[PDB]
């Protein structure tokens, strides 16, 4: 059906666009900082062992 | 001979300090408390190799 009040194609495209933008931000932050663990949300056990090391 | 024994005892205490203080993030290695620890190298469970530190 061709309807004007809804766009599921646009909704899906937005969902993957934000998924790609969030991954883009994460990689940019790892490149500038030089660390792959900038927060516990990256890898918690790695943050604790790396902090103790 | 006593003078040489002084450096023997200093070095012997040096070995015990190395054994008791060497660690990997607080995990003592050389004092014998490490014993045997298995390292999981594999994409599925049950594939690990036993490293023994004495």
Swiss-Prot record, chain A:
Disulfide bonds: none
Superkingdom field: Bacteria
Localisation per UniProt entry: Secreted; Bacterial flagellum
Transmembrane segment boundaries: none
Misc. comment: V.cholerae is able to differentially regulate the flagellins within the flagellum maybe to produce flagella which are particularly suited for motility within a given environment.
Function: Flagellin is the subunit protein which polymerizes to form the filaments of bacterial flagella. FlaD is not essential for flagellar synthesis and motility.
Quaternary organization: Heteromer of multiple flagellin subunits including FlaA, FlaB, FlaC, FlaD and FlaE.
Protein family: Belongs to the bacterial flagellin family.
Protein's name in the database: Flagellin D
From-to range in the entire protein, with total length: 2 to 54 of 377
Curated annotation (Swiss-Prot), chain B:
Coiled-coil regions listed in the entry: 1-21
Compartment annotation: Secreted; Bacterial flagellum
Function: Flagellin is the subunit protein which polymerizes to form the filaments of bacterial flagella. FlaD is not essential for flagellar synthesis and motility.
Assembly description: Heteromer of multiple flagellin subunits including FlaA, FlaB, FlaC, FlaD and FlaE.
Additional notes on this entry: V.cholerae is able to differentially regulate the flagellins within the flagellum maybe to produce flagella which are particularly suited for motility within a given environment.
Protein family: Belongs to the bacterial flagellin family.
This protein's name: Flagellin D
